[PDB]
Scaffold this motif. Structure first.
Motif, short mmCIF file in Angstrom:
data_model
loop_
_atom_site.label_atom_id
_atom_site.label_comp_id
_atom_site.label_asym_id
_atom_site.label_seq_id
_atom_site.Cartn_x
_atom_site.Cartn_y
_atom_site.Cartn_z
N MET A 1 -26.11 9.16 31.17
CA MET A 1 -26.98 8.39 32.04
C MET A 1 -27.72 9.29 33.02
O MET A 1 -27.55 9.16 34.23
CB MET A 1 -26.17 7.34 32.81
N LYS A 2 -28.53 10.20 32.49
CA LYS A 2 -29.29 11.10 33.35
C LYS A 2 -30.38 10.35 34.09
O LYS A 2 -30.69 10.65 35.25
CB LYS A 2 -29.87 12.24 32.51
N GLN A 3 -30.96 9.34 33.44
CA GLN A 3 -32.08 8.64 34.04
C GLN A 3 -31.63 7.67 35.13
O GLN A 3 -32.36 7.43 36.09
CB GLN A 3 -32.87 7.90 32.96
N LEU A 4 -30.43 7.11 34.99
CA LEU A 4 -29.98 6.12 35.97
C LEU A 4 -29.58 6.78 37.28
O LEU A 4 -29.89 6.26 38.36
CB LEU A 4 -28.81 5.32 35.40
N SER A 5 -28.92 7.93 37.22
CA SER A 5 -28.52 8.62 38.44
C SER A 5 -29.71 9.26 39.12
O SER A 5 -29.72 9.40 40.35
CB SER A 5 -27.45 9.67 38.13
N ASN A 6 -30.72 9.67 38.35
CA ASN A 6 -31.93 10.23 38.95
C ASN A 6 -32.73 9.17 39.68
O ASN A 6 -33.46 9.48 40.63
CB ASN A 6 -32.78 10.90 37.87
N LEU A 7 -32.60 7.91 39.26
CA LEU A 7 -33.25 6.82 39.98
C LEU A 7 -32.57 6.56 41.31
O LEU A 7 -33.24 6.38 42.34
CB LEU A 7 -33.24 5.56 39.12
N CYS A 8 -31.24 6.56 41.33
CA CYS A 8 -30.51 6.09 42.50
C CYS A 8 -30.56 7.11 43.63
O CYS A 8 -30.52 6.74 44.81
CB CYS A 8 -29.06 5.78 42.12
N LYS A 9 -30.64 8.40 43.29
CA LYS A 9 -30.67 9.42 44.32
C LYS A 9 -32.01 9.46 45.03
O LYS A 9 -32.10 9.83 46.20
CB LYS A 9 -30.34 10.79 43.73
N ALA A 10 -33.08 9.08 44.33
CA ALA A 10 -34.40 9.08 44.94
C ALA A 10 -34.56 7.90 45.89
O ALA A 10 -35.36 7.96 46.83
CB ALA A 10 -35.48 9.06 43.87
N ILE A 11 -33.81 6.83 45.66
CA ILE A 11 -33.93 5.65 46.50
C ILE A 11 -33.21 5.86 47.82
O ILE A 11 -33.71 5.50 48.89
CB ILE A 11 -33.42 4.41 45.73
N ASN A 12 -32.03 6.49 47.77
CA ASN A 12 -31.25 6.73 48.98
C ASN A 12 -31.95 7.72 49.90
O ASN A 12 -31.83 7.64 51.13
CB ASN A 12 -29.86 7.23 48.62
N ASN A 13 -32.68 8.67 49.33
CA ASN A 13 -33.48 9.57 50.15
C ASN A 13 -34.68 8.85 50.73
O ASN A 13 -35.10 9.12 51.86
CB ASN A 13 -33.94 10.77 49.32
N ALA A 14 -35.25 7.91 49.97
CA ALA A 14 -36.44 7.21 50.44
C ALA A 14 -36.09 6.15 51.47
O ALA A 14 -36.77 6.03 52.49
CB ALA A 14 -37.17 6.58 49.25
N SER A 15 -35.04 5.37 51.22
CA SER A 15 -34.74 4.24 52.08
C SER A 15 -34.16 4.68 53.41
O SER A 15 -34.20 3.94 54.40
CB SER A 15 -33.78 3.28 51.38
N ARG A 16 -33.59 5.89 53.46
CA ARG A 16 -33.05 6.39 54.72
C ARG A 16 -34.17 6.88 55.63
O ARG A 16 -34.13 6.66 56.85
CB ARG A 16 -32.04 7.50 54.44
N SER B 1 -39.30 6.28 32.73
CA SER B 1 -38.96 4.87 32.60
C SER B 1 -38.04 4.68 31.41
O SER B 1 -38.09 5.44 30.44
CB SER B 1 -40.20 4.00 32.44
N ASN B 2 -37.19 3.66 31.48
CA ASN B 2 -36.13 3.47 30.52
C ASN B 2 -35.69 2.01 30.51
O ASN B 2 -35.78 1.33 31.53
CB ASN B 2 -34.95 4.38 30.83
N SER B 3 -35.21 1.56 29.36
CA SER B 3 -34.86 0.15 29.20
C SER B 3 -33.59 -0.21 29.97
O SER B 3 -33.34 -1.39 30.24
CB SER B 3 -34.70 -0.19 27.72
N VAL B 4 -32.78 0.78 30.31
CA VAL B 4 -31.63 0.52 31.17
C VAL B 4 -32.07 0.33 32.61
O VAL B 4 -31.53 -0.51 33.33
CB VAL B 4 -30.61 1.67 31.04
N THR B 5 -33.08 1.09 33.04
CA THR B 5 -33.53 1.01 34.42
C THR B 5 -34.30 -0.27 34.69
O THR B 5 -34.31 -0.77 35.82
CB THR B 5 -34.40 2.22 34.76
N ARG B 6 -34.95 -0.82 33.67
CA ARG B 6 -35.74 -2.03 33.87
C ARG B 6 -34.85 -3.25 34.07
O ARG B 6 -35.18 -4.14 34.86
CB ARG B 6 -36.69 -2.25 32.69
N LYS C 1 -43.29 9.99 28.86
CA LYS C 1 -42.02 9.54 29.42
C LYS C 1 -42.17 8.24 30.21
O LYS C 1 -41.20 7.50 30.38
CB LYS C 1 -41.42 10.63 30.29
N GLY C 2 -43.37 7.96 30.71
CA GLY C 2 -43.60 6.75 31.46
C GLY C 2 -43.37 6.95 32.94
O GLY C 2 -42.74 7.91 33.38
N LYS C 3 -43.92 6.04 33.74
CA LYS C 3 -43.80 6.12 35.19
C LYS C 3 -43.28 4.80 35.74
O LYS C 3 -43.32 3.77 35.07
CB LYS C 3 -45.15 6.48 35.83
N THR C 4 -42.77 4.85 36.97
CA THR C 4 -42.22 3.67 37.64
C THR C 4 -42.63 3.67 39.11
O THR C 4 -42.51 4.69 39.80
CB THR C 4 -40.70 3.62 37.54
#
Ligand SMILES: [Mg+2]
Ligand SMILES: [Mg+2]
Ligand SMILES: [Mg+2]
Ligand SMILES: [Mg+2]
Ligand SMILES: [Mg+2]
Ligand SMILES: [Zn+2]
Lengths: 97, 127, 117, 63, 217, 197
Positions: free
Chosen positions: B1-16, B27-32, B55-58
RNA sequence: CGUAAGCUGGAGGAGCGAAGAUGAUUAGAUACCAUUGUAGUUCCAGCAGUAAACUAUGCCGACGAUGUGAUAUGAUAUUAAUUGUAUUAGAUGAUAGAAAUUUGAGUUUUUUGGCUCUGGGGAUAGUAUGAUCGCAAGAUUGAAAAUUAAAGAAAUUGACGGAAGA
């Protein structure tokens, strides 16, 4: 602890440099970790500047100067007071020419 | 799950720091299916994603209500009787928080996993 | 002796504040007034106080004595500087405008009369 | 136990926040006058230190 | 007696501000110990935690001072801790008690489960760290009581929590850092943003702006 | 909304729209362009009028205007703020700002203000530094190259020339007089001589 | 594959120079000082595999604050500039840390993207014994019996210097 940021010398992205030799003692030192000074002295003294004028066969002429470069290890350098111990917060000042 | 953990770390940096929007380059069908569960309970605003034969963008727009989001690796097979054990570990209080399980019916909350008596592999958590 | 004590200077600075108006230019009349308003044990230290008072008062009238405010001397000094010039800077009709700054004045549609260099 | 919520980042503001200030603006009608009404906003302590506090306020009022 | 040198303390002597709640929500920092004393009388509970002597060397001898820590507390949800060092052990405690009144803070209370019932427990899990010591507070069901060590139980009795679960990590033999970490642990639980706080609160005016005309005249 | 009338002749004379060689990241929208030979940026005189309205809007509705402090360290700045303070009933602080006048209670002149005004942000750092300890609102006249920490309203002007700094006090003196008492602004243009040397 | 020494074979040897021998200093000098002096350091063909072999920081992958520089190169533009990608030096803030310090040594008790190797209080000890390599010197692997309440890292205040300046 660590004393300086660059550890002894200013060398980065390299592996090695060929060594040079001090003039006073004569021990081998790398060319980065050396102390080099430059000074220019004339052949004639200023105290003998007027006395050559009465002995000149020429009318006007220029007195010439020569340059020198010296190299030292840091044991010889601090002993002759070329480079002195400075304050800790004042160590980071760099006097470029 | 390289794509799922890369999503979550960018959000915690952004939301803080307090930014408004975010742009990721994968982008990935698990993330959607992850974000639709985050959109349903009301933690974020709308989002969008672009296909460009690559690879797609989100692109996601935040509102400032996230405390921490995360992902778990490796994905453990959990039975029905151990959901009460995992929920005490990863959640602050009993009144709120959420879990995502990759059950055969779909990616659902632990409240629907207990209510339909289905145990499966675990994905992550957000609150 | 040649350098005054901080007890002398501090006690001299207070007498300038409350008793500014009875001071004068001459030194010998300041010897009398400190016998009325100050309670001093000795004689030799008393002459140093009155000699220091004429030092401060004369350096108020012409010099720059920092860290000391007296309300009476500053008021009339501003009245000398409350005069008005007959001609201000605002009398000029022609303003010098750069060709970069010209476009802002046309964009906002202002009514000034602008002439370039 | 009540907590003030910042209007800019939409988060609650702590009790020991040393930089949180309530900005007070009077309401002014057309042609310019005085009206005896005060409208307030609240800010957080971290947003002022970075220097973002000015650009939020211009877009809050004039647009 | 007490005299209100600070302008903020003059309003509480003239009965303008009724309770502590307008102070904490409007985040007005207090700078006199007399404000909490006039607001709260004979409900102040206090103690000392530890007393240690430090000794500094000079040329001839060794000057010796005494350091003490004091925890101040209410019955329901007001805790402050301050420190001081002095030459005399008697005046060491007295000034340190006043500085603890300047550092007072409130704490949020909640339930174990459900919505209705008297508040007894800290709401969520939190963790406080101050210098290689980590204290962790876990909420508990009702009827358990406080289960902790010698020092941080006595702090939690001042806060008013009836029951909680604790753990420790790191060097706890220095009681100064062990007391400072539970302060951050109690603060971090109260600073979490909840979905029950999604409703919009009412805007208000600062109380200094309202009574400004009374103060100057 | 009020309209600036014949104040464009004041700012274009006094070089208040002149800027520096480089611009900071947060200044941004206030630059309209740069000169070609000397590479000096310009300031839009439209949006600076918008901050003049807004700074007056925060200064008014104070019940007592004595709770408003002005600081200045520049030697030329003394004459201009003292003409400004008397018309607006504000307490002026001139010279070196003593550390501790807001926090420490043992200084000779303690003061508990509500609104703070700063001439130059870089030249007066300690007033902004002590405004982070106690909750205060700050107004500052800032150049194109300044930091904007701990300041919520910025009036972009030119703060190097001493003649320009008296102008911003002069326009501020009319608006608070205009918002409080209904009067025609720009009564006498010749009253700028009392501000300048 | 692997600086520097060290080994067998042939070529060469200007300066430098372990070991050895003399002159001074010294209670004593087989050490520092000075004069000599052999192997070696140079080339070709091979063995050998150790260093403070250090950025004392394993390798791959996603996101990050401003300012001044350096190497290569492309676009706009034209004699006047501001801009793209890959490396790299430094300063100020921000985080993290026991601290010195710090764009990672950050995104951690609100601990998880993947994979190899190493440590478990000091000392005995990188010492014994066995096995595998090498012409040899030696290299890799690597314990125990009997012992002991300390060993250690970063930082403040003094005292001292056959330490330096005003
Ligand atoms: Mg090397
Ligand atoms: Mg080999
Ligand atoms: Mg080795
Ligand atoms: Mg190593
Ligand atoms: Mg390595
Ligand atoms: Zn040498």
């Amino acid at each position: 602890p660590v004393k300086r940021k660059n550890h002894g010398k200013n060398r980065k992205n390299r592996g090695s440099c060929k060594p040079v030799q001090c003039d006073k003692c004569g021990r081998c030192v790398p060319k980065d970790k050396a102390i080099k000074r430059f000074k220019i002295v004339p052949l004639v003294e200023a105290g003998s500047m007027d006395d050559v004028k009465v002995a000149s066969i020429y009318d006007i002429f220029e007195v010439p100067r020569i340059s020198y470069k010296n190299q030292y290890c840091i044991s010889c350098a601090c002993h002759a007071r070329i480079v002195r111990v400075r304050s800790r917060q004042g160590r980071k000042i760099r006097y470029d020419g | 799950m390289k794509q799922l953990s890369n999503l979550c770390k960018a959000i915690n940096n952004a939301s803080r720091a307090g930014k408004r929007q975010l742009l990721l380059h994968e982008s990935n069908s698990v993330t959607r299916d992850f974000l639709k569960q985050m959109l349903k309970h009301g933690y974020i605003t709308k989002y969008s994603y672009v296909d460009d034969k690559r690879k797609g963008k989100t692109i996601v727009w935040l509102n400032g209500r996230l405390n921490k989001c995360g992902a778990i690796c490796p994905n453990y097979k959990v039975s029905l009787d151990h959901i009460e054990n995992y929920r005490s570990r990863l959640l602050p209080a009993r009144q709120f928080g959420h879990l995502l399980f990759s059950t055969e019916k779909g990616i659902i909350d632990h409240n629907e996993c207990i209510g339909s008596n289905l145990g499966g592999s675990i994905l992550g958590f957000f609150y | 002796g040649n350098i005054r004590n901080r007890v002398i200077k501090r006690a001299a600075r207070q007498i300038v504040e409350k008793h500014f108006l009875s001071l004068d230019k001459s030194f010998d009349d300041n010897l009398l007034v400190v016998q009325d308003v100050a309670l001093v044990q000795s004689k030799r230290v008393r002459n140093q106080i009155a000699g220091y008072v004429t030092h401060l008062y004369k350096c108020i009238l012409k010099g720059t004595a920092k860290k000391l405010y007296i309300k009476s001397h500053e008021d009339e000094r501003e009245k000398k500087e409350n005069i008005m010039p007959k001609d201000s800077i605002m009398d000029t009709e022609v303003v010098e405008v750069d060709p970069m700054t010209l476009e802002m004045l046309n964009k906002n549609e202002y009514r000034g009369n602008f002439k370039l260099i | 136990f009540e907590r003030r919520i910042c209007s800019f980042t939409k988060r609650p503001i702590a009790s020991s926040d040393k930089s949180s200030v309530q900005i007070t603006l009077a309401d002014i009608d057309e042609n310019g006058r005085l009206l005896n009404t005060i409208s307030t906003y609240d800010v957080c302590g971290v947003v002022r230190r970075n220097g973002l506090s000015d650009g939020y306020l211009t877009d809050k009022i004039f647009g | 007696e007490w005299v209100p040198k600070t302008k903020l303390g003059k309003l509480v002597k003239d009965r303008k501000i009724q309770s502590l709640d307008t102070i904490f929500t409007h985040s007005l920092q207090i700078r006199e110990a007399g404000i909490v004393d006039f607001l709260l009388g004979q409900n102040i509970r206090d103690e000392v935690l530890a007393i240690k002597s430090v000794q500094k060397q000079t040329r001839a001898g060794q000057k010796t001072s005494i350091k003490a820590v004091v925890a101040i507390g209410d019955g329901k949800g007001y805790v402050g801790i301050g420190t001081f060092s002095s030459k005399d052990a008697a005046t060491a405690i007295k000034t340190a008690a006043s500085k603890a009144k300047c550092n007072i803070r409130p704490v949020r209370l909640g339930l174990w489960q459900g919505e209705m019932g008297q508040v007894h427990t800290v709401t969520t899990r939190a963790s406080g760290k101050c210098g290689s010591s980590v204290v962790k507070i876990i909420p508990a069901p009702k009827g358990t009581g406080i289960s902790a060590s010698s020092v941080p139980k006595t702090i939690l009795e001042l806060a008013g929590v009836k029951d909680a679960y604790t753990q420790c990590f790191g060097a706890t033999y220095t009681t100064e850092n062990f007391a400072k970490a539970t302060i951050e642990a109690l603060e971090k639980s109260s600073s979490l943003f909840l979905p029950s706080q999604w409703t919009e609160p009412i805007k208000q005016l600062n109380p200094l702006m309202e009574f400004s005309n009374h103060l100057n005249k | 909304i009020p309209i600036p009338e014949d104040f464009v002749k004041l700012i274009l004379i006094s070089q208040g729209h002149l800027g520096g060689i480089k611009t900071s990241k947060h200044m941004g929208r206030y630059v309209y362009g740069t000169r070609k030979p000397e590479n000096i940026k310009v300031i839009d005189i439209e949006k600076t009028w918008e901050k003049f309205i807004l700074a007056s809007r925060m200064f008014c509705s104070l019940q007592n205007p004595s709770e408003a402090v002005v600081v200045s360290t520049k030697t030329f700045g003394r004459k201009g703020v003292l003409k400004f303070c008397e018309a607006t009933n504000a307490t002026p602080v001139i010279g070196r700002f003593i550390p501790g006048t807001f926090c420490n209670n043992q200084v000779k002149r303690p003061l508990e203000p509500r609104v703070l005004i700063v001439s130059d942000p870089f030249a007066d750092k300690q007033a902004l530094d002590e405004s982070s300890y106690v909750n205060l609102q700050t107004v500052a006249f800032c150049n194109t190259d300044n930091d904007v920490s701990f300041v919520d309203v910025v009036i972009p002007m030119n703060n190097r020339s001493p003649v320009s700094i008296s102008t911003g006090l002069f326009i501020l003196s009319r608006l608070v007089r205009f918002m409080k008492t209904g009067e025609p602004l720009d009564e006498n243009m010749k009253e700028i001589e009392l501000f300048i040397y």
